[PDB]
Amino acid sequence: SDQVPVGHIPRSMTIMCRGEVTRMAQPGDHIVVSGVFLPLMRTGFAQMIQGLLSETFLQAHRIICINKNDEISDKDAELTPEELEELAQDDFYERLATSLAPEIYGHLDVKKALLLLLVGGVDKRPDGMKIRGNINICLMGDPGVAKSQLLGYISRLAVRSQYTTGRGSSGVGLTAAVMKDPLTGEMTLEGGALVLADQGVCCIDEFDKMADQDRTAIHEVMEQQTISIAKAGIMTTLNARVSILAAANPAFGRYNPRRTVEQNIQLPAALLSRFDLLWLIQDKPDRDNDLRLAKHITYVHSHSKQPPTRVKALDMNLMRRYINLCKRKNPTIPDELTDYIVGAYVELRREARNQKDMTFTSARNLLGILRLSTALARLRLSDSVEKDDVAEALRLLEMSKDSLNQ
Amino acid sequence: KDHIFPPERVELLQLLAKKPDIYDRLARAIAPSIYENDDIKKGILLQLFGGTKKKHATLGRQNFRSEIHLLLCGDPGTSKSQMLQYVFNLVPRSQYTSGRGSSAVGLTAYVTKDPETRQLVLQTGALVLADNGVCCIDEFDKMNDSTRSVLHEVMEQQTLSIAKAGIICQLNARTSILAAANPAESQWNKRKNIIDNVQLPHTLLSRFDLIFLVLDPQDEIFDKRLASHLVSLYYVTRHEEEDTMFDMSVLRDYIAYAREHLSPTLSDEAQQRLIQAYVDMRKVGAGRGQISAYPRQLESLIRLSEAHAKVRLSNQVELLDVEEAWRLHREALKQSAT
Amino acid sequence: VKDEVGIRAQKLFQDFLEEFKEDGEIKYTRPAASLESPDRCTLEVSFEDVEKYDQNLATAIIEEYYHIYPFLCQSVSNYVKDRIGLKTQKDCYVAFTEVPTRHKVRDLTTSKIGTLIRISGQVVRTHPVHPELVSGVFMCLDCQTEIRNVEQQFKFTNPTICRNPVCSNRKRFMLDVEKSLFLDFQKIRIQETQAELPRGCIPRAVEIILRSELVETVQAGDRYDFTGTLIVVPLAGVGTRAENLNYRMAFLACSVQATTARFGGTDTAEDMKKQMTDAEWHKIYEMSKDRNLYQNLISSLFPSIYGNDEVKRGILLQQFGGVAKTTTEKTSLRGDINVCIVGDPSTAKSQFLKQVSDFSPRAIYTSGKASSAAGLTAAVVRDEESFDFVIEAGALMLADNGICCIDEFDKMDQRDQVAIHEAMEQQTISIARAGVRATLNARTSILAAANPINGRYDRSKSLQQNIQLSAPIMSRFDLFFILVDECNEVVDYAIARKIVDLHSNIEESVERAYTREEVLRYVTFARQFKPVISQEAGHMLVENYGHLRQRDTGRITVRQLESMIRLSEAMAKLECSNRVLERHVKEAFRLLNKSIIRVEQ
DNA sequence: ATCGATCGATCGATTTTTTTTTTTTT
DNA sequence: TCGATCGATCGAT
Numbered sequence A: 001s002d003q004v005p006v007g008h009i010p011r012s013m014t015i016m017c018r019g020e021v022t023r024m025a026q027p028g029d030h031i032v033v034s035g036v037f038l039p040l041m042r043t044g045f046a047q048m049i050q051g052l053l054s055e056t057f058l059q060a061h062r063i064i065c066i067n068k069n070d071e072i073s074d075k076d077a078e079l080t081p082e083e084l085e086e087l088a089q090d091d092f093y094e095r096l097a098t099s100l101a102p103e104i105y106g107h108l109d110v111k112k113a114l115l116l117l118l119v120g121g122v123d124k125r126p127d128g129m130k131i132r133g134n135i136n137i138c139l140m141g142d143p144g145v146a147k148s149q150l151l152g153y154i155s156r157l158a159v160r161s162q163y164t165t166g167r168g169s170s171g172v173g174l175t176a177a178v179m180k181d182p183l184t185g186e187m188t189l190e191g192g193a194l195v196l197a198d199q200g201v202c203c204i205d206e207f208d209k210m211a212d213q214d215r216t217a218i219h220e221v222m223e224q225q226t227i228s229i230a231k232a233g234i235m236t237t238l239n240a241r242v243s244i245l246a247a248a249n250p251a252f253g254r255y256n257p258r259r260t261v262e263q264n265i266q267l268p269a270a271l272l273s274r275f276d277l278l279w280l281i282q283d284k285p286d287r288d289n290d291l292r293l294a295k296h297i298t299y300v301h302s303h304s305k306q307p308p309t310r311v312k313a314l315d316m317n318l319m320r321r322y323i324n325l326c327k328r329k330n331p332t333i334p335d336e337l338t339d340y341i342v343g344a345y346v347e348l349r350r351e352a353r354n355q356k357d358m359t360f361t362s363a364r365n366l367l368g369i370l371r372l373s374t375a376l377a378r379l380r381l382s383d384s385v386e387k388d389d390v391a392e393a394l395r396l397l398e399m400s401k402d403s404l405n406q
Numbered sequence B: 001k002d003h004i005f006p007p008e009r010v011e012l013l014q015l016l017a018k019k020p021d022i023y024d025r026l027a028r029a030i031a032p033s034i035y036e037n038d039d040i041k042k043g044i045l046l047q048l049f050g051g052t053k054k055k056h057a058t059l060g061r062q063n064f065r066s067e068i069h070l071l072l073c074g075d076p077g078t079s080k081s082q083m084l085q086y087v088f089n090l091v092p093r094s095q096y097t098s099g100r101g102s103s104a105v106g107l108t109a110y111v112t113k114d115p116e117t118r119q120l121v122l123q124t125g126a127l128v129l130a131d132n133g134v135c136c137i138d139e140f141d142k143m144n145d146s147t148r149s150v151l152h153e154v155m156e157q158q159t160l161s162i163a164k165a166g167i168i169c170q171l172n173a174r175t176s177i178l179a180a181a182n183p184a185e186s187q188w189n190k191r192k193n194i195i196d197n198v199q200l201p202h203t204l205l206s207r208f209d210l211i212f213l214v215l216d217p218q219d220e221i222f223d224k225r226l227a228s229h230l231v232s233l234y235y236v237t238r239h240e241e242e243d244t245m246f247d248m249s250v251l252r253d254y255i256a257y258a259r260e261h262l263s264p265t266l267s268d269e270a271q272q273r274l275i276q277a278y279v280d281m282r283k284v285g286a287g288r289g290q291i292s293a294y295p296r297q298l299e300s301l302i303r304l305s306e307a308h309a310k311v312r313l314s315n316q317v318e319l320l321d322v323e324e325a326w327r328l329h330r331e332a333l334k335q336s337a338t
Numbered sequence C: 001v002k003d004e005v006g007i008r009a010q011k012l013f014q015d016f017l018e019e020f021k022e023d024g025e026i027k028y029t030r031p032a033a034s035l036e037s038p039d040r041c042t043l044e045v046s047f048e049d050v051e052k053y054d055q056n057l058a059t060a061i062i063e064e065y066y067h068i069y070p071f072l073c074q075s076v077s078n079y080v081k082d083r084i085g086l087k088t089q090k091d092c093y094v095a096f097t098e099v100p101t102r103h104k105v106r107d108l109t110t111s112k113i114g115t116l117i118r119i120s121g122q123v124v125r126t127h128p129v130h131p132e133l134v135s136g137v138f139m140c141l142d143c144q145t146e147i148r149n150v151e152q153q154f155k156f157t158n159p160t161i162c163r164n165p166v167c168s169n170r171k172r173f174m175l176d177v178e179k180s181l182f183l184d185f186q187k188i189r190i191q192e193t194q195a196e197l198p199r200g201c202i203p204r205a206v207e208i209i210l211r212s213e214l215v216e217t218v219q220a221g222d223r224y225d226f227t228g229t230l231i232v233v234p235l236a237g238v239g240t241r242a243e244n245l246n247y248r249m250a251f252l253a254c255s256v257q258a259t260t261a262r263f264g265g266t267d268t269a270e271d272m273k274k275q276m277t278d279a280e281w282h283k284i285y286e287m288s289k290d291r292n293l294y295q296n297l298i299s300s301l302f303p304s305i306y307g308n309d310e311v312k313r314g315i316l317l318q319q320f321g322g323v324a325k326t327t328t329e330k331t332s333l334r335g336d337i338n339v340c341i342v343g344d345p346s347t348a349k350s351q352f353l354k355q356v357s358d359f360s361p362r363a364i365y366t367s368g369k370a371s372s373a374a375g376l377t378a379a380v381v382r383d384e385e386s387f388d389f390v391i392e393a394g395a396l397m398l399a400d401n402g403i404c405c406i407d408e409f410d411k412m413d414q415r416d417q418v419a420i421h422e423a424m425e426q427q428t429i430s431i432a433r434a435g436v437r438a439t440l441n442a443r444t445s446i447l448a449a450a451n452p453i454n455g456r457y458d459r460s461k462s463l464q465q466n467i468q469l470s471a472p473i474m475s476r477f478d479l480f481f482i483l484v485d486e487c488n489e490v491v492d493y494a495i496a497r498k499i500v501d502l503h504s505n506i507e508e509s510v511e512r513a514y515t516r517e518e519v520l521r522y523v524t525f526a527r528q529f530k531p532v533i534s535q536e537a538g539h540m541l542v543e544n545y546g547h548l549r550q551r552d553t554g555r556i557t558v559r560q561l562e563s564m565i566r567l568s569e570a571m572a573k574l575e576c577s578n579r580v581l582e583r584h585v586k587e588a589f590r591l592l593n594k595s596i597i598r599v600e601q
Numbered sequence D: 001a002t003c004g005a006t007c008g009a010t011c012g013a014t015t016t017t018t019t020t021t022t023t024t025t026t
Numbered sequence E: 001t002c003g004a005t006c007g008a009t010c011g012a013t
C-alpha cells in the first residue's frame, strides 16, 4: 500500500513456505521473502478448472523480514551496555517529553502523560485479583486542535497500534468475525481492530458517532481482558489487554453558557465515568499565541524539521528501546507517604466538593493515582517513588477538571 | 441431596445461632472489609436467608408467596455494581445482566434457529433459569418500555404464560429481585423526592417493599479511614480472623441448611401492634400528590417478620423481629416529610 | 430364535386373560370389544399387570424390546382371532403405561436400546402428518407378482428376486398403492426438561416420533410421560470405514400421558339427561329449590374476602348463561356481556380475578402490556421463515367461549382499545397490512380494571370526567359497581382478623355451607335448558323501560335494555328453570338503577 | 455337442451461494 | 472415476 498504482486496489499472493521455515512470519511484519515463483494445478472439474488458466502460487525458502522483525528489532528492549553510552549521555525527562510529535508547540502536559500510556508497567496478582495498568483517556472539544494528528502519529510510533473512526467499521469489524481457512477450513474466528491491539493501544477518533450499541462494546474493556460477543452467542471469550486512546467532538457548540457536561455532550455518562483522565481541548482567542503557532507550523513546510537550536529532540529509534527498558522495574509502594496519599485524596475530593453541582468526582481516583505514579517511576527505573513524584499527578488531575473557570 | 451435611456441623451451626450477636455478625461478615452502611446488609440477609415458604398445598387459593423484593438506589460512586459482582460470587444462582443489558425479549424467549437440529425451535429465557434464586441488576433506568411491564407480571402474579405463532406456554418461574437503579443525573436532587426523580409511576415507585436509600457519604471525614485501611488491605495482601470470626466455609452452611428444615409459624405475636395503632397509622387521607401507607404493608411485614424469625431458627415466630421490622420501615418511610 | 420364549409367555398371558384377568372381571377385552366393530388396531397394556401375574417379564421385555416388539403384534392377532371371525388385518398400536421408572435425556448411552423408559419435556416446532405407503408388491415382470412380503423396512428397497419363477432380480414389477399397507405418524422435536433444570449446557434437543393413534392428541405447551425405545437410525465422522457410514442419534416412543392440559367437561351415580352431566340430582334438586340459595351462593366463593356484597351477587353474571335461542338468519344474537371495575388503590381489585381464571376452565387471564401490541393480533413478522407474513393469532382471541380479563385498563394504547371499541359487540375483527382478508372471531365477555385519574374519588366532577377518556365505550359496559375507600377502623380490624384465620394453621378460615365442586357442576348444568319467555313481564317490560326513562327523562338507551332482559334471563337460569318470570325483572331493574345512580353525582 | 455362468473389455454420466437495496410498519 | 452392457469363454451336461 505504498507502491500500488494511482487508481488501483491492493492485491495479494499466496505463500507455501516449506522446509524448516514454518513459523517465520507474524501478522503485521513488513517481511522480505526470497524464493521461486511456480505454477499450480488445482486439479478438479475439467470445465471451470482445466481451462488452461494457471491459478499460480508462490514458493520460498528464506524469510528475512527487513521491517519490524528479529533483524531490525534487537532483543530477539532490555540490552543495557549498548545504550549506557547514551544513557548517562543525557539526564532529563521533558527532553523525552516534547520529542513526541515535535512539529508544533503547545499541549505539553498532554504528551508526557500520553507517554505514560506507552509504558505503564504496573502488574501484580494481589489477593488473586489482577489490576489493569492500561490508561484509557479521551479527547473532547475540537474547533481545530490537531486531534487526528497525535492519534495518527503515535499509532505509527507505538508498536502494534491501530486506527479507526465512527462509521469506518461495524461492530464485527471491531470484534471477531469468521472466514474459511485455507490451512484447514475450520471456519475459525478472526478479530477486529480491538481484538488484536492488546498489550498496546488501539486508537479511536470521533467516538460519539461511532455507534449506539458500540458504547457497551467499549464499556466492556473497562473490566479488562473481557471481550464478550454474541456472534455465535455461546461464550465468545477473548483476552484483550489493550489500552484505549479515545477522542471525539462536541455537538453544535462548545460548552454553551448554560450547558454542562452530559448536556452539551451526548455520550453515555456511565461511559464517561469509567475513564481515569478526561481530556477536553478548548482554545479561546489568544492574541499572541496564534502568531506563535503560525511561525511554528509554517516552518513545517519550508523544510522538514521543526525544533531548531533549542534542544536535541531524540530519534524515534532510540525512543523505542528507551521506553522498553523502563518497564521491567515493578517497584514497591512507599508506606511513608501512604499516610499522605490519602490526605492528597482528601484535598482532591474536598476542593471539588466545596461546590454543590460541579462535575462528578469519583471514588476510583485513589485506584487511579496509584497506577500512574508507578509507571512514572518506571522511567526512573529505581523503585524510589517520592513525595514529589505524585506532586505532578496532583496538578495533573487538578487541571484535568475545572477547565472552564477562566 | 448432594449437600446433605453430617450432624457434627450442627454443633458449630447452632453455636453461631445461640447468640443474639448473629444478627450483626453475618451482616458484618458479608463484605471483605467494607465497614460502612452495615445497617442495610442486615436486611439483605433476609434475602440471603431467602424468605419463607407458606406453601399452598392447602386449598389452591391466592398464591400468596413470601414474595420479597428490595432494591438499592443512589449515586454511581457507591460500590453497587462492585458489591453485586461480589454478590455474584456469593449467591448460588447468580445472574447478572442489568438495565440496558438485555430487553424483555432479551430476558425471555431467545427464539432463533440452530444448525444442530438445523430447524427452527421454540426456545429459552433468562429469568426462569433463576427460579427461587437471584439476579443482580444495575443501571435500571435505561430499559425499553416494552420491558418493565414484563416484571409487573412476575412481581404481582409470580407467573408466566407465553404465546407466539409457535408454542403457547405456561411455565413456572418465581424469584426475588435485586437491582441497583440510578437516576438521569449524577446526584439525587434535594427538594425533588424519589416520588418523581427516577422514571416510574406515581404509586408504583413505592410499590416495592422498601427502597433502602443510598448516596455518597457527603462527608470528607470518612475518606481517610478507608483510604488508609483498604489500601493497607492491599499492602499486606492477606486477612485476619478478628472478633467477627470469619468461618472459611462453615458459615456458608448456616445459609445452606436453613432453607429446608424450617417452617415459621405465628402464635400471637406479629399482628397486634398495628392492629391497635391503625387509626393514626391509617389517617393517610391527607396529602397533595403524595404516597404513603396502604393496607398491603402487613403482607410484606409478616414476610420480613417470619424471615427474621428464620434467623435464630425460631420455628415459632420471633417477637423481636417486629421491632427491627418497624425500624426497617420507618428508617426510610418519611424521607419526604417536606 | 430368541422371542419364542416371549411367544409362549404372552400365549399363557392370553390364556389367563382369556379367562378372567381381575376378580372374575376383564379390563383388556372390553377395549377389544369396542375395537371389534371398526378395528382401529390399538390396545394399551399396564406394565404393572406384567408384574402382577406373569412374574417379571420386565427383564424379559425391557432390554431386548425391539426384537420382541413385532412378536407381540402376532400375540395381539392370536388374541383377537380366538372369538371373532378374523382376517389378518389385525395390527398393533401400543400406548404402554404403568411403568415405575422415569429418567431424563442425560442417562443415554449406547447400552440403552430396546427399553421402555419414561421421559418428559416440552413441545416445540411440531410437524405435520406425513403418510407412508410402507408396503406394496414387487417382484419380476413375467406373471408371478403377488408379494405380501417384508418390504416395510426403514431403508426401503425395491429389489426382490422372485417367489415362484427363476427370472430377473434387477428388473422390478411396478408398485401397489391399492391393496397394501399404509400407516400414519408425525414428527417433532422436544427441548430440555423443566422438571429437570440443570445449569451449564444448552437445552439439548431430542428427536422423537409418535404413531398413528398417538397423532394429534399432543400439542405445543405440554409436559409428557413417554416410552424409551431408542433406536438405530437408518459428514465430520472421519472414523474408520468397513464393508464385507456415519450415523446420528434418533429416538421414537409409543405411549403418551399429555397431562397438565386436561379438564373434561361434565360427564351421585344416578339417572339423568346424560351419563354424568348432572347425575347429582340427589342434591341439585335441593340446589334449585332453596329460597336462600342466592345468598348461600354469594358467600360460597369469597370466604377469604370481605368488602362490598354487591358484586358478590352480580359477577356470577359473567360465568352465567345468556340466551342460546332458535331463530332465523337475521343476525347474531348475543349471550354474555361486559362488566367493569374501578376502585381506590388496592382494595383487592386484582384478587377478584387472579383466582377467577383458576375458577372456571377455558378462560385464561393476563395483561397484554406483558407483551407488545400483540394482545389482539399475533406477532407481526417481516422476515422469511415460510412466506414472510404470518399473523393468525394473538392473546385476546385465545379466549373463545371463555374470558380473558385485563389489568391496568387505562394506561393501554388506543390501538388494541380502539379495536375493542368494535370487537365486543359485532364480535368479528379484521385488519390489513398482512391479512389474507383477515376474518377472525372472538366471542366472549370481559372484566375491567380501571383506576381513577389522581387515584382518589373526589366528587368534584362527573364520572365521565372522573376518568376523562373517550366516551361511547362507557355504555356497552352494562354494570360498573365501583369499590370505595374510606377511613374507619372497624372494617380494617375485621380485615386483620381475617388474617387471624389465614395462618393460624388449624382452622385458618370460617365455616361454610356449600362446597365448590357441587356449585360449579350445578352452574355447568344450568346452561343446557333452552329457556322460555311467555310471561306478562315479557308483555309488561315496556312500562318498566318507560319508567326507567321517565327517570332518565330528567347517557341513554336501548343497549342497556338488551342488557336488561339478559341479566334477568341469566338470573332465571340461576333458578334452574325455563319459562321466564316477572321477579328476575325487578331484581335486574334494581341492579340497573344501582348502576346508574352509582354513576350519578 | 448344447447351454449357463463368470470375466472382463466397452460403453456412457457427474461436478453454482451470501449482501444488499428497496419496502412496510412499529 | 464410477456403473451396467454386452460379448466372449470354460465346465456341465
Ligand SMILES: Nc1ncnc2c1ncn2[C@@H]1O[C@H](COP(=O)(O)OP(=O)(O)O)[C@@H](O)[C@H]1O
Residues within 6 Å of the ligand: A103, A104, A105, A106, A142, A144, A145, A146, A147, A148, A149, A205, A249, A293, A297
Ligand atoms: N498549532 C498547530 N500545529 C500543527 N498543526 C495544526 C495546528 N493547529 C491546527 N493544525 C492542523 O489542524 C488539523 C486538525 O485536524 P483534527 O482536529 O485532527 O480533525 P478532527 O477534529 O476531525 O479530529 C491537524 O491535521 C493539523 O494539521
Ligand SMILES: Nc1ncnc2c1ncn2[C@@H]1O[C@H](COP(=O)(O)OP(=O)(O)O)[C@@H](O)[C@H]1O
Residues within 6 Å of the ligand: A363, A364, A367, B034, B036, B075, B076, B077, B078, B079, B080, B081, B082, B083, B138
Ligand atoms: N464504601 C465503599 N466501599 C468500597 N468501595 C467504594 C465505597 N464507596 C465507593 N467505592 C468505590 O466505588 C467503586 C465501585 O463502584 P460501582 O458499583 O462499580 O459503580 P457503578 O455501580 O455506578 O458502576 C469501587 O472502585 C470503589 O473504589
Ligand SMILES: Nc1ncnc2c1ncn2[C@@H]1O[C@H](COP(=O)(O)OP(=O)(O)O)[C@@H](O)[C@H]1O
Residues within 6 Å of the ligand: B156, B295, B296, C304, C305, C306, C307, C345, C346, C347, C348, C349, C350, C351, C495
Ligand atoms: N375485603 C377484603 N378482603 C380481602 N382482602 C382485602 C380486602 N380489602 C383489601 N384487601 C387486601 O388488599 C390487597 C390488594 O392488592 P392488589 O389490589 O391485588 O394489588 P394491585 O393493586 O397491585 O393489584 C389484597 O392483597 C388484599 O390482601
